[PDB]
């Protein structure tokens, strides 16, 4: 659920989430857009996790 996704992201990446938008892809996998709070930057955490 979106609450579970928000809590999991918060616990994993030590981030605060504004909102989460989810969808089911036409392959069986669930895709979620995690909106970050204005205090944190998505590019910085993306560099930290390794994706760029």
């Amino acid at each position: 659920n979106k609450h579970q996704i928000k809590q999991a992201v918060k616990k994993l990446y030590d981030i605060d989430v504004a909102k989460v938008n989810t969808l089911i892809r036409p392959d069986g996998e669930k895709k979620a857009y995690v909106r970050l709070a204005p205090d944190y930057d998505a590019l910085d955490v993306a560099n930290k996790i390794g994706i760029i």
Binding site: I24, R25, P26, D27, G28
Partner: protein, 50 residues
């Protein structure tokens, strides 16, 4: 139909994932008798009669 249920969507997703062709490195195995997927499904014929 753009108004599908969850079960139908999962079924369609599984069929779509199964529709892919056979990888090439399978042919290089020792005991291999397979040349093509032979189960490819097109959307014009064999209309998946759900």
């Amino acid at each position: 139909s753009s108004h599908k249920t969850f079960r139908i969507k999962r079924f369609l997703a599984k069929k779509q994932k199964q529709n892919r062709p056979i990888p090439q490195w399978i042919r290089m195995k020792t005991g291999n008798k397979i040349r093509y997927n032979s189960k490819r499904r097109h959307w014009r014929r064999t209309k998946l009669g759900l």
